[PDB]
Amino acid sequence: PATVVAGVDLGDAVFAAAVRAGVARVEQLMDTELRQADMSDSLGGKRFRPLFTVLSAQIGPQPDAAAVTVAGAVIEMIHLATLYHDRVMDGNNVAILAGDYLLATASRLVARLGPEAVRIIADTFAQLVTGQMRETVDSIEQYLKVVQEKTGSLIGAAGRLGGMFSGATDEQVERLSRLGGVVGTAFQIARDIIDIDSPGTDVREGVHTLPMLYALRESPDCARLDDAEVREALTLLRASPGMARAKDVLAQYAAQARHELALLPDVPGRRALAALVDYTVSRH
Amino acid sequence: ATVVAGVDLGDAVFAAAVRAGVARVEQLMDTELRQSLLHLFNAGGKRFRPLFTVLSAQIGPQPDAAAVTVAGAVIEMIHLATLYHDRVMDQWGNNVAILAGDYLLATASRLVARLGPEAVRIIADTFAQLVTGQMRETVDSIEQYLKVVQEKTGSLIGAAGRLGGMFSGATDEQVERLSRLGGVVGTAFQIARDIIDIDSPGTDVREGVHTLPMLYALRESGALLNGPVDDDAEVREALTLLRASPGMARAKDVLAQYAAQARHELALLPDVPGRRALAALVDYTVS
Q1: What is the separation of C-alpha A111 from the centre of its chain, rounded to a whole number of angstroms?
Q2: CATH number for the B12-138+141-277 domain, one of 1.10.3720.10, 1.10.600.10, 3.10.180.10, 1.10.1040.10?
Q3: Which residues bind isopentenyl diphosphate (chain A)?
Q4: Could you tell me which chain B residue has the CA closest to the CA of A127?
Q5: Residues of chain B neighbouring A108 (CB-CB closer than 8 A)
Q6: Subunit contact A122:B109, Cβ cutoff 8 A
Q7: Cβ pair B91, B97 in contact under 8 A
Q8: For domain A4-280, which CATH number applies: 3.40.50.980, 3.40.50.12780, 1.10.600.10, 2.60.40.10?
Protein backbone atom coordinates (compact mmCIF):
# COMPACT_ATOMS: atom_id res chain seq x y z
CA PRO A 1 0.00 0.00 0.00
CA ALA A 2 2.81 2.48 0.75
CA THR A 3 3.84 2.25 -2.92
CA VAL A 4 0.24 2.42 -4.23
CA VAL A 5 -1.56 5.59 -5.32
CA ALA A 6 -5.10 5.46 -6.74
CA GLY A 7 -4.67 1.70 -7.08
CA VAL A 8 -1.46 1.98 -9.17
CA ASP A 9 1.67 0.34 -7.75
CA LEU A 10 4.42 2.91 -8.18
CA GLY A 11 7.09 0.50 -6.92
CA ASP A 12 8.88 2.96 -4.65
CA ALA A 13 7.34 4.29 -1.43
CA VAL A 14 9.36 7.54 -1.29
CA PHE A 15 8.35 8.24 -4.90
CA ALA A 16 4.77 7.17 -4.14
CA ALA A 17 4.61 9.71 -1.29
CA ALA A 18 5.68 12.59 -3.53
CA VAL A 19 3.12 11.54 -6.16
CA ARG A 20 0.39 10.93 -3.55
CA ALA A 21 1.06 14.45 -2.22
CA GLY A 22 0.62 15.85 -5.73
CA VAL A 23 -2.74 14.06 -5.95
CA ALA A 24 -3.69 15.33 -2.46
CA ARG A 25 -2.82 18.88 -3.59
CA VAL A 26 -5.32 18.42 -6.45
CA GLU A 27 -8.16 17.35 -4.15
CA GLN A 28 -7.30 20.16 -1.73
CA LEU A 29 -7.56 22.72 -4.54
CA MET A 30 -10.88 21.21 -5.67
CA ASP A 31 -12.21 21.34 -2.10
CA THR A 32 -11.08 24.97 -1.76
CA GLU A 33 -12.46 26.09 -5.13
CA LEU A 34 -15.84 24.38 -4.69
CA ARG A 35 -16.63 25.15 -1.03
CA GLN A 36 -18.75 28.29 -0.68
CA ALA A 37 -21.05 29.73 2.00
CA ASP A 38 -23.94 27.36 1.22
CA MET A 39 -22.31 20.26 0.06
CA SER A 40 -21.31 16.63 -0.16
CA ASP A 41 -20.79 17.84 -3.72
CA SER A 42 -17.55 16.06 -4.71
CA LEU A 43 -18.72 12.87 -2.98
CA GLY A 44 -16.22 7.76 -9.69
CA GLY A 45 -14.81 10.67 -7.74
CA LYS A 46 -11.41 9.08 -7.93
CA ARG A 47 -7.75 9.94 -8.08
CA PHE A 48 -7.06 8.16 -11.39
CA ARG A 49 -7.16 11.29 -13.53
CA PRO A 50 -5.29 13.35 -10.90
CA LEU A 51 -2.70 10.55 -10.79
CA PHE A 52 -2.51 10.59 -14.60
CA THR A 53 -2.01 14.36 -14.69
CA VAL A 54 0.72 14.30 -12.03
CA LEU A 55 2.51 11.37 -13.69
CA SER A 56 2.34 13.07 -17.09
CA ALA A 57 3.99 16.15 -15.59
CA GLN A 58 6.76 13.83 -14.43
CA ILE A 59 7.70 13.37 -18.10
CA GLY A 60 8.74 16.96 -18.83
CA PRO A 61 11.97 18.39 -17.39
CA GLN A 62 10.44 21.30 -15.41
CA PRO A 63 7.11 20.48 -13.75
CA ASP A 64 5.19 23.55 -12.60
CA ALA A 65 3.64 21.99 -9.52
CA ALA A 66 1.12 24.82 -9.00
CA ALA A 67 -0.05 24.65 -12.63
CA VAL A 68 -0.06 20.84 -12.54
CA THR A 69 -2.34 21.02 -9.49
CA VAL A 70 -4.68 23.35 -11.38
CA ALA A 71 -4.78 21.07 -14.45
CA GLY A 72 -5.59 18.00 -12.36
CA ALA A 73 -8.33 19.83 -10.48
CA VAL A 74 -9.76 21.03 -13.83
CA ILE A 75 -9.70 17.55 -15.37
CA GLU A 76 -11.23 15.78 -12.39
CA MET A 77 -13.97 18.35 -11.81
CA ILE A 78 -14.96 17.85 -15.45
CA HIS A 79 -14.94 14.07 -14.87
CA LEU A 80 -17.25 14.39 -11.87
CA ALA A 81 -19.63 16.65 -13.77
CA THR A 82 -19.97 14.14 -16.62
CA LEU A 83 -20.88 11.59 -13.94
CA TYR A 84 -23.59 13.85 -12.52
CA HIS A 85 -25.07 14.47 -15.98
CA ASP A 86 -24.80 10.80 -16.96
CA ARG A 87 -26.82 9.71 -13.91
CA VAL A 88 -29.85 11.76 -14.93
CA MET A 89 -29.71 10.61 -18.56
CA ASP A 90 -28.90 7.04 -17.41
CA GLY A 91 -32.45 14.69 -7.30
CA ASN A 92 -32.37 15.08 -11.10
CA ASN A 93 -32.53 18.89 -11.24
CA VAL A 94 -30.05 19.22 -8.36
CA ALA A 95 -27.67 16.67 -9.88
CA ILE A 96 -27.67 18.69 -13.12
CA LEU A 97 -27.00 21.94 -11.26
CA ALA A 98 -24.15 20.28 -9.34
CA GLY A 99 -22.60 19.16 -12.61
CA ASP A 100 -23.06 22.63 -14.04
CA TYR A 101 -21.28 24.15 -11.01
CA LEU A 102 -18.41 21.67 -11.42
CA LEU A 103 -18.16 22.69 -15.08
CA ALA A 104 -18.23 26.40 -14.25
CA THR A 105 -15.54 26.00 -11.59
CA ALA A 106 -13.35 23.94 -13.94
CA SER A 107 -13.61 26.64 -16.60
CA ARG A 108 -12.73 29.33 -14.05
CA LEU A 109 -9.64 27.36 -12.93
CA VAL A 110 -8.24 26.61 -16.39
CA ALA A 111 -8.29 30.32 -17.26
CA ARG A 112 -5.35 30.61 -14.85
CA LEU A 113 -3.38 28.30 -17.15
CA GLY A 114 -3.55 30.70 -20.09
CA PRO A 115 -4.92 30.77 -23.64
CA GLU A 116 -3.61 27.41 -24.86
CA ALA A 117 -5.03 25.49 -21.88
CA VAL A 118 -8.35 27.28 -22.31
CA ARG A 119 -8.67 26.12 -25.93
CA ILE A 120 -7.73 22.56 -24.95
CA ILE A 121 -10.55 22.42 -22.42
CA ALA A 122 -13.10 24.00 -24.78
CA ASP A 123 -12.21 21.42 -27.43
CA THR A 124 -12.55 18.68 -24.82
CA PHE A 125 -16.03 19.93 -23.91
CA ALA A 126 -16.92 19.70 -27.61
CA GLN A 127 -15.82 16.06 -27.70
CA LEU A 128 -17.73 15.31 -24.49
CA VAL A 129 -20.99 16.65 -25.89
CA THR A 130 -20.30 14.96 -29.24
CA GLY A 131 -20.09 11.55 -27.56
CA GLN A 132 -23.23 12.10 -25.50
CA MET A 133 -24.86 13.23 -28.73
CA ARG A 134 -23.58 10.07 -30.44
CA GLU A 135 -24.48 7.80 -27.52
CA THR A 136 -28.13 8.84 -27.69
CA VAL A 137 -23.61 2.39 -38.63
CA ASP A 138 -21.40 -0.35 -37.18
CA SER A 139 -22.65 -0.49 -33.61
CA ILE A 140 -19.25 -1.42 -32.15
CA GLU A 141 -17.40 1.24 -34.12
CA GLN A 142 -19.93 3.65 -32.58
CA TYR A 143 -19.53 2.33 -29.04
CA LEU A 144 -15.76 2.75 -29.27
CA LYS A 145 -16.35 6.21 -30.76
CA VAL A 146 -18.50 7.12 -27.75
CA VAL A 147 -16.00 6.15 -25.08
CA GLN A 148 -13.16 7.79 -27.01
CA GLU A 149 -15.20 11.02 -27.08
CA LYS A 150 -16.66 10.95 -23.58
CA THR A 151 -13.81 9.25 -21.73
CA GLY A 152 -10.59 9.11 -23.76
CA SER A 153 -10.64 12.78 -24.73
CA LEU A 154 -10.60 13.99 -21.11
CA ILE A 155 -7.68 11.79 -20.07
CA GLY A 156 -5.92 12.89 -23.25
CA ALA A 157 -6.28 16.51 -22.14
CA ALA A 158 -4.84 15.56 -18.74
CA GLY A 159 -1.85 14.04 -20.52
CA ARG A 160 -1.56 17.12 -22.75
CA LEU A 161 -1.71 19.55 -19.84
CA GLY A 162 0.73 17.40 -17.85
CA GLY A 163 3.27 17.56 -20.67
CA MET A 164 2.72 21.25 -21.40
CA PHE A 165 3.16 22.34 -17.79
CA SER A 166 6.34 20.34 -17.27
CA GLY A 167 7.89 21.88 -20.38
CA ALA A 168 7.86 18.63 -22.35
CA THR A 169 8.63 18.97 -26.04
CA ASP A 170 5.80 19.43 -28.52
CA GLU A 171 6.15 15.84 -29.67
CA GLN A 172 6.06 14.43 -26.11
CA VAL A 173 2.92 16.49 -25.37
CA GLU A 174 1.21 15.01 -28.43
CA ARG A 175 2.31 11.55 -27.29
CA LEU A 176 0.99 12.04 -23.76
CA SER A 177 -2.30 13.26 -25.22
CA ARG A 178 -2.51 10.14 -27.41
CA LEU A 179 -1.60 7.88 -24.48
CA GLY A 180 -4.32 9.42 -22.30
CA GLY A 181 -6.91 8.92 -25.03
CA VAL A 182 -5.99 5.27 -25.41
CA VAL A 183 -5.80 4.80 -21.63
CA GLY A 184 -9.33 6.16 -21.16
CA THR A 185 -10.78 3.76 -23.72
CA ALA A 186 -8.91 0.70 -22.43
CA PHE A 187 -10.00 1.59 -18.88
CA GLN A 188 -13.66 1.55 -19.95
CA ILE A 189 -13.30 -1.70 -21.91
CA ALA A 190 -11.70 -3.37 -18.89
CA ARG A 191 -14.66 -2.09 -16.83
CA ASP A 192 -17.11 -3.60 -19.33
CA ILE A 193 -15.27 -6.93 -19.11
CA ILE A 194 -14.77 -6.91 -15.32
CA ASP A 195 -18.47 -6.30 -14.66
CA ILE A 196 -19.31 -9.66 -16.28
CA ASP A 197 -16.24 -11.67 -15.14
CA SER A 198 -17.05 -10.81 -11.48
CA PRO A 199 -17.52 -6.15 -7.09
CA GLY A 200 -21.16 -6.81 -7.93
CA THR A 201 -21.67 -8.49 -11.28
CA ASP A 202 -24.01 -7.28 -14.03
CA VAL A 203 -24.60 -4.15 -12.00
CA ARG A 204 -25.14 -3.07 -15.59
CA GLU A 205 -28.89 -3.38 -16.20
CA GLY A 206 -29.74 -1.57 -19.44
CA VAL A 207 -26.20 -0.77 -20.59
CA HIS A 208 -24.99 -2.43 -23.81
CA THR A 209 -21.26 -2.80 -23.13
CA LEU A 210 -18.56 -4.10 -25.47
CA PRO A 211 -18.73 -7.85 -24.61
CA MET A 212 -22.53 -7.70 -24.97
CA LEU A 213 -22.27 -5.89 -28.31
CA TYR A 214 -20.06 -8.69 -29.61
CA ALA A 215 -22.25 -11.53 -28.27
CA LEU A 216 -25.42 -10.14 -29.87
CA ARG A 217 -23.77 -10.50 -33.31
CA GLU A 218 -23.36 -14.30 -33.12
CA SER A 219 -25.93 -16.91 -34.17
CA PRO A 220 -28.82 -18.71 -28.61
CA ASP A 221 -30.84 -15.64 -27.68
CA CYS A 222 -30.57 -12.90 -25.07
CA ALA A 223 -33.00 -12.13 -22.29
CA ARG A 224 -31.95 -8.51 -22.48
CA LEU A 225 -33.24 -4.96 -21.88
CA ASP A 226 -35.55 -9.94 -12.94
CA ASP A 227 -32.87 -11.66 -10.84
CA ALA A 228 -32.70 -15.08 -12.48
CA GLU A 229 -33.04 -13.18 -15.77
CA VAL A 230 -29.88 -11.33 -14.72
CA ARG A 231 -27.89 -14.44 -13.80
CA GLU A 232 -29.23 -16.20 -16.91
CA ALA A 233 -27.83 -13.30 -18.93
CA LEU A 234 -24.50 -13.55 -17.09
CA THR A 235 -23.81 -17.18 -18.03
CA LEU A 236 -24.36 -16.44 -21.72
CA LEU A 237 -21.84 -13.58 -21.79
CA ARG A 238 -19.06 -15.35 -19.87
CA ALA A 239 -19.46 -18.23 -22.33
CA SER A 240 -19.92 -16.27 -25.61
CA PRO A 241 -17.02 -15.66 -28.01
CA GLY A 242 -18.05 -12.03 -27.58
CA MET A 243 -16.14 -12.00 -24.30
CA ALA A 244 -12.91 -13.17 -25.97
CA ARG A 245 -13.54 -10.62 -28.74
CA ALA A 246 -13.89 -7.79 -26.21
CA LYS A 247 -10.58 -8.80 -24.62
CA ASP A 248 -8.93 -8.63 -28.03
CA VAL A 249 -10.06 -5.01 -28.45
CA LEU A 250 -8.73 -4.29 -24.95
CA ALA A 251 -5.44 -5.85 -26.01
CA GLN A 252 -5.33 -3.60 -29.09
CA TYR A 253 -5.55 -0.50 -26.91
CA ALA A 254 -3.02 -1.95 -24.45
CA ALA A 255 -0.69 -2.53 -27.42
CA GLN A 256 -1.14 1.06 -28.59
CA ALA A 257 -0.60 2.50 -25.10
CA ARG A 258 2.60 0.49 -24.75
CA HIS A 259 3.76 1.63 -28.19
CA GLU A 260 3.37 5.23 -27.01
CA LEU A 261 5.03 4.47 -23.66
CA ALA A 262 8.13 3.13 -25.43
CA LEU A 263 8.87 6.45 -27.15
CA LEU A 264 8.53 8.43 -23.94
CA PRO A 265 11.81 9.62 -22.38
CA ASP A 266 13.59 7.16 -20.08
CA VAL A 267 12.61 8.96 -16.90
CA PRO A 268 10.88 7.70 -13.73
CA GLY A 269 7.53 9.09 -14.95
CA ARG A 270 7.60 6.67 -17.88
CA ARG A 271 7.80 3.64 -15.55
CA ALA A 272 5.05 5.17 -13.41
CA LEU A 273 2.85 5.53 -16.50
CA ALA A 274 3.55 1.95 -17.58
CA ALA A 275 2.36 0.75 -14.18
CA LEU A 276 -0.68 2.96 -14.70
CA VAL A 277 -1.26 1.20 -18.03
CA ASP A 278 -0.80 -2.22 -16.39
CA TYR A 279 -3.39 -1.38 -13.76
CA THR A 280 -5.68 0.09 -16.42
CA VAL A 281 -5.86 -3.16 -18.41
CA SER A 282 -6.01 -5.23 -15.19
CA ARG A 283 -8.93 -6.09 -12.84
CA HIS A 284 -8.85 -2.53 -11.38
CA ALA B 1 -39.46 54.38 -35.03
CA THR B 2 -36.62 55.03 -32.59
CA VAL B 3 -37.62 51.90 -30.64
CA VAL B 4 -35.61 48.68 -30.51
CA ALA B 5 -37.30 46.34 -28.05
CA GLY B 6 -40.16 48.31 -26.59
CA VAL B 7 -37.49 50.83 -25.57
CA ASP B 8 -37.29 54.30 -27.10
CA LEU B 9 -33.54 54.95 -27.35
CA GLY B 10 -33.48 58.43 -28.87
CA ASP B 11 -31.97 59.30 -32.23
CA ALA B 12 -32.89 57.04 -35.14
CA VAL B 13 -29.24 56.67 -36.15
CA PHE B 14 -28.35 55.34 -32.70
CA ALA B 15 -31.35 52.99 -32.71
CA ALA B 16 -30.37 51.72 -36.15
CA ALA B 17 -26.84 50.99 -35.00
CA VAL B 18 -28.23 49.16 -31.96
CA ARG B 19 -30.78 47.11 -33.95
CA ALA B 20 -27.95 46.06 -36.25
CA GLY B 21 -25.73 45.10 -33.31
CA VAL B 22 -28.43 42.91 -31.77
CA ALA B 23 -29.25 41.30 -35.12
CA ARG B 24 -25.53 40.51 -35.47
CA VAL B 25 -25.66 38.63 -32.14
CA GLU B 26 -28.63 36.53 -33.25
CA GLN B 27 -26.86 35.78 -36.55
CA LEU B 28 -23.61 34.73 -34.86
CA MET B 29 -25.63 32.51 -32.51
CA ASP B 30 -27.43 30.85 -35.43
CA THR B 31 -24.19 30.31 -37.33
CA GLU B 32 -22.16 29.00 -34.39
CA LEU B 33 -24.95 26.70 -33.12
CA ARG B 34 -25.49 24.79 -36.38
CA GLN B 35 -24.17 21.22 -36.25
CA SER B 36 -32.23 19.09 -34.38
CA LEU B 37 -31.03 18.95 -30.78
CA LEU B 38 -32.43 22.43 -30.09
CA HIS B 39 -34.89 24.80 -31.76
CA LEU B 40 -34.10 28.47 -31.20
CA PHE B 41 -37.03 30.86 -31.33
CA ASN B 42 -36.49 33.99 -33.42
CA ALA B 43 -37.26 36.90 -31.09
CA GLY B 44 -36.42 39.44 -33.79
CA GLY B 45 -33.98 41.44 -31.73
CA LYS B 46 -35.96 41.53 -28.46
CA ARG B 47 -33.75 39.30 -26.25
CA PHE B 48 -32.89 41.35 -23.13
CA ARG B 49 -29.29 40.22 -22.72
CA PRO B 50 -27.90 40.88 -26.26
CA LEU B 51 -29.58 44.29 -26.08
CA PHE B 52 -27.91 45.09 -22.75
CA THR B 53 -24.54 43.96 -24.11
CA VAL B 54 -24.92 46.06 -27.28
CA LEU B 55 -26.14 49.07 -25.30
CA SER B 56 -23.22 48.72 -22.87
CA ALA B 57 -20.80 48.57 -25.80
CA GLN B 58 -22.13 51.95 -27.00
CA ILE B 59 -20.15 53.44 -24.11
CA GLY B 60 -16.89 52.32 -25.73
CA PRO B 61 -15.19 53.81 -28.79
CA GLN B 62 -15.63 50.50 -30.72
CA PRO B 63 -19.25 49.42 -30.06
CA ASP B 64 -19.28 47.26 -33.20
CA ALA B 65 -16.05 45.39 -32.48
CA ALA B 66 -16.47 41.73 -33.43
CA ALA B 67 -15.66 40.68 -29.86
CA VAL B 68 -18.78 42.56 -28.67
CA THR B 69 -20.98 40.33 -30.84
CA VAL B 70 -19.21 37.21 -29.55
CA ALA B 71 -19.78 38.41 -25.98
CA GLY B 72 -23.47 38.98 -26.64
CA ALA B 73 -23.88 35.55 -28.24
CA VAL B 74 -21.95 33.93 -25.38
CA ILE B 75 -24.14 35.65 -22.78
CA GLU B 76 -27.33 34.60 -24.52
CA MET B 77 -26.21 30.97 -24.99
CA ILE B 78 -25.51 30.77 -21.26
CA HIS B 79 -29.00 32.10 -20.58
CA LEU B 80 -30.51 29.63 -23.05
CA ALA B 81 -28.64 26.72 -21.49
CA THR B 82 -30.15 27.55 -18.09
CA LEU B 83 -33.62 27.47 -19.69
CA TYR B 84 -32.93 23.97 -21.00
CA HIS B 85 -31.44 22.73 -17.71
CA ASP B 86 -34.38 24.34 -15.87
CA ARG B 87 -36.64 21.82 -17.64
CA VAL B 88 -35.00 18.78 -16.02
CA MET B 89 -37.77 17.02 -14.08
CA ASP B 90 -37.29 15.37 -10.69
CA GLN B 91 -38.55 18.68 -24.17
CA TRP B 92 -38.85 15.17 -25.46
CA GLY B 93 -37.27 14.33 -22.10
CA ASN B 94 -34.65 14.94 -19.45
CA ASN B 95 -31.95 13.65 -21.79
CA VAL B 96 -32.73 16.15 -24.56
CA ALA B 97 -32.92 19.08 -22.13
CA ILE B 98 -29.59 18.19 -20.51
CA LEU B 99 -27.92 17.64 -23.87
CA ALA B 100 -29.36 20.81 -25.41
CA GLY B 101 -28.09 22.81 -22.43
CA ASP B 102 -24.68 21.12 -22.58
CA TYR B 103 -24.48 21.90 -26.30
CA LEU B 104 -25.12 25.60 -25.72
CA LEU B 105 -22.54 25.51 -22.90
CA ALA B 106 -19.92 23.79 -25.09
CA THR B 107 -20.56 26.26 -27.92
CA ALA B 108 -20.31 29.15 -25.46
CA SER B 109 -16.98 27.66 -24.26
CA ARG B 110 -15.53 27.69 -27.76
CA LEU B 111 -16.61 31.29 -28.37
CA VAL B 112 -15.49 32.74 -25.04
CA ALA B 113 -12.19 30.82 -25.22
CA ARG B 114 -11.20 32.95 -28.19
CA LEU B 115 -12.10 36.10 -26.27
CA GLY B 116 -9.29 35.21 -23.85
CA PRO B 117 -8.64 33.83 -20.35
CA GLU B 118 -9.99 36.90 -18.53
CA ALA B 119 -13.28 36.68 -20.43
CA VAL B 120 -13.30 32.93 -19.70
CA ARG B 121 -12.94 33.68 -15.99
CA ILE B 122 -15.77 36.24 -16.02
CA ILE B 123 -18.25 33.97 -17.83
CA ALA B 124 -17.27 30.89 -15.82
CA ASP B 125 -17.58 32.76 -12.53
CA THR B 126 -20.90 34.21 -13.72
CA PHE B 127 -22.26 30.76 -14.62
CA ALA B 128 -21.04 29.47 -11.24
CA GLN B 129 -22.88 32.41 -9.63
CA LEU B 130 -25.94 31.68 -11.75
CA VAL B 131 -25.90 28.03 -10.66
CA THR B 132 -25.46 28.67 -6.92
CA GLY B 133 -28.31 31.15 -7.27
CA GLN B 134 -30.50 28.25 -8.41
CA MET B 135 -29.11 25.98 -5.68
CA ARG B 136 -29.70 28.71 -3.08
CA GLU B 137 -33.27 29.21 -4.33
CA THR B 138 -33.90 25.56 -3.48
CA VAL B 139 -31.47 34.98 8.31
CA ASP B 140 -32.91 38.07 6.61
CA SER B 141 -35.49 36.76 4.12
CA ILE B 142 -35.23 39.87 1.92
CA GLU B 143 -31.45 39.98 1.75
CA GLN B 144 -31.69 36.22 1.13
CA TYR B 145 -34.10 36.60 -1.79
CA LEU B 146 -32.04 39.48 -3.16
CA LYS B 147 -28.86 37.42 -2.95
CA VAL B 148 -30.66 34.69 -4.90
CA VAL B 149 -31.89 36.92 -7.72
CA GLN B 150 -28.56 38.75 -7.84
CA GLU B 151 -26.86 35.37 -8.31
CA LYS B 152 -29.41 33.69 -10.58
CA THR B 153 -30.33 36.70 -12.77
CA GLY B 154 -28.31 39.83 -11.98
CA SER B 155 -24.82 38.37 -12.47
CA LEU B 156 -25.35 37.38 -16.09
CA ILE B 157 -26.58 40.87 -16.95
CA GLY B 158 -23.68 42.33 -14.99
CA ALA B 159 -21.42 40.17 -17.17
CA ALA B 160 -23.10 41.51 -20.31
CA GLY B 161 -22.32 45.03 -19.15
CA ARG B 162 -18.76 44.05 -18.23
CA LEU B 163 -18.10 42.27 -21.53
CA GLY B 164 -19.83 44.95 -23.59
CA GLY B 165 -17.62 47.58 -21.99
CA MET B 166 -14.39 45.56 -22.23
CA PHE B 167 -14.58 44.67 -25.90
CA SER B 168 -16.00 47.97 -27.14
CA GLY B 169 -12.85 49.50 -25.62
CA ALA B 170 -14.48 51.37 -22.72
CA THR B 171 -12.29 52.58 -19.85
CA ASP B 172 -11.60 50.39 -16.82
CA GLU B 173 -13.80 52.50 -14.56
CA GLN B 174 -16.53 52.40 -17.19
CA VAL B 175 -16.33 48.60 -17.40
CA GLU B 176 -16.80 48.44 -13.61
CA ARG B 177 -19.71 50.88 -13.65
CA LEU B 178 -21.46 48.95 -16.45
CA SER B 179 -20.98 45.69 -14.52
CA ARG B 180 -22.59 47.25 -11.40
CA LEU B 181 -25.39 48.72 -13.53
CA GLY B 182 -26.07 45.31 -15.05
CA GLY B 183 -26.38 43.58 -11.70
CA VAL B 184 -28.81 46.17 -10.41
CA VAL B 185 -30.83 46.21 -13.65
CA GLY B 186 -31.03 42.41 -13.69
CA THR B 187 -32.27 42.39 -10.09
CA ALA B 188 -34.90 45.00 -10.91
CA PHE B 189 -35.70 42.93 -14.01
CA GLN B 190 -36.41 39.91 -11.79
CA ILE B 191 -38.25 41.87 -9.09
CA ALA B 192 -40.42 43.25 -11.89
CA ARG B 193 -41.09 39.73 -13.21
CA ASP B 194 -41.96 38.57 -9.69
CA ILE B 195 -44.43 41.41 -9.20
CA ILE B 196 -45.93 40.90 -12.67
CA ASP B 197 -46.42 37.20 -11.86
CA ILE B 198 -48.98 38.35 -9.24
CA ASP B 199 -50.51 41.43 -10.98
CA SER B 200 -52.61 41.58 -14.16
CA PRO B 201 -49.98 34.37 -14.02
CA GLY B 202 -49.56 32.48 -10.74
CA THR B 203 -46.54 30.42 -11.88
CA ASP B 204 -44.59 31.30 -8.72
CA VAL B 205 -47.41 30.31 -6.36
CA ARG B 206 -47.85 26.97 -8.17
CA GLU B 207 -44.09 26.43 -8.17
CA GLY B 208 -43.87 27.23 -4.45
CA VAL B 209 -41.19 29.89 -4.99
CA HIS B 210 -41.26 32.77 -2.49
CA THR B 211 -40.79 36.12 -4.21
CA LEU B 212 -40.43 39.65 -2.85
CA PRO B 213 -44.19 40.47 -2.54
CA MET B 214 -44.87 37.21 -0.67
CA LEU B 215 -41.83 37.54 1.60
CA TYR B 216 -42.89 40.98 2.82
CA ALA B 217 -46.46 39.72 3.31
CA LEU B 218 -45.31 36.84 5.56
CA ARG B 219 -43.83 39.51 7.86
CA GLU B 220 -47.23 40.78 9.03
CA SER B 221 -49.85 38.94 11.12
CA GLY B 222 -53.64 38.62 11.22
CA ALA B 223 -48.66 31.28 5.13
CA LEU B 224 -50.56 28.73 3.02
CA LEU B 225 -47.64 29.01 0.57
CA ASN B 226 -45.68 26.37 2.50
CA GLY B 227 -45.11 24.16 -0.51
CA PRO B 228 -46.40 24.33 -4.09
CA VAL B 229 -50.05 24.67 -5.13
CA ASP B 230 -51.76 22.35 -7.62
CA ASP B 231 -55.45 23.31 -7.64
CA ASP B 232 -56.39 26.26 -9.85
CA ALA B 233 -58.89 27.43 -7.23
CA GLU B 234 -56.26 28.03 -4.54
CA VAL B 235 -54.06 29.74 -7.16
CA ARG B 236 -56.72 32.37 -7.89
CA GLU B 237 -57.13 32.77 -4.12
CA ALA B 238 -53.48 33.51 -3.27
CA LEU B 239 -53.18 36.01 -6.12
CA THR B 240 -56.09 38.16 -4.88
CA LEU B 241 -54.87 37.82 -1.28
CA LEU B 242 -51.28 38.78 -2.16
CA ARG B 243 -52.66 41.56 -4.37
CA ALA B 244 -54.12 43.07 -1.17
CA SER B 245 -51.23 42.68 1.27
CA PRO B 246 -49.09 45.78 1.94
CA GLY B 247 -46.17 43.48 1.11
CA MET B 248 -47.19 44.02 -2.50
CA ALA B 249 -46.73 47.79 -2.12
CA ARG B 250 -43.43 47.17 -0.33
CA ALA B 251 -42.06 45.07 -3.20
CA LYS B 252 -42.96 47.91 -5.60
CA ASP B 253 -41.08 50.32 -3.35
CA VAL B 254 -38.01 48.08 -3.39
CA LEU B 255 -38.31 47.83 -7.18
CA ALA B 256 -38.39 51.62 -7.41
CA GLN B 257 -35.34 51.70 -5.13
CA TYR B 258 -33.43 49.39 -7.48
CA ALA B 259 -34.35 51.69 -10.37
CA ALA B 260 -32.94 54.64 -8.39
CA GLN B 261 -29.83 52.52 -7.74
CA ALA B 262 -29.45 51.93 -11.49
CA ARG B 263 -29.93 55.64 -12.24
CA HIS B 264 -27.20 56.48 -9.76
CA GLU B 265 -24.92 54.04 -11.55
CA LEU B 266 -25.63 55.26 -15.05
CA ALA B 267 -25.59 58.98 -14.17
CA LEU B 268 -21.78 58.90 -14.00
CA LEU B 269 -21.33 57.36 -17.46
CA PRO B 270 -20.19 59.77 -20.21
CA ASP B 271 -22.88 62.09 -21.57
CA VAL B 272 -23.38 60.19 -24.83
CA PRO B 273 -26.41 58.61 -26.57
CA GLY B 274 -25.64 55.24 -24.97
CA ARG B 275 -26.20 56.63 -21.48
CA ARG B 276 -29.67 57.84 -22.47
CA ALA B 277 -30.52 54.49 -24.07
CA LEU B 278 -29.47 52.73 -20.85
CA ALA B 279 -31.54 55.21 -18.83
CA ALA B 280 -34.49 54.40 -21.09
CA LEU B 281 -33.92 50.65 -20.73
CA VAL B 282 -33.98 51.10 -16.94
CA ASP B 283 -37.24 53.04 -17.07
CA TYR B 284 -38.83 50.44 -19.33
CA THR B 285 -37.68 47.50 -17.17
CA VAL B 286 -39.33 48.86 -14.01
CA SER B 287 -42.50 49.96 -15.86
Answers
A1: 22
A2: 1.10.600.10
A3: 46, 49, 79
A4: B106
A5: 120-121, 124-125, 128
A6: yes
A7: yes
A8: 1.10.600.10
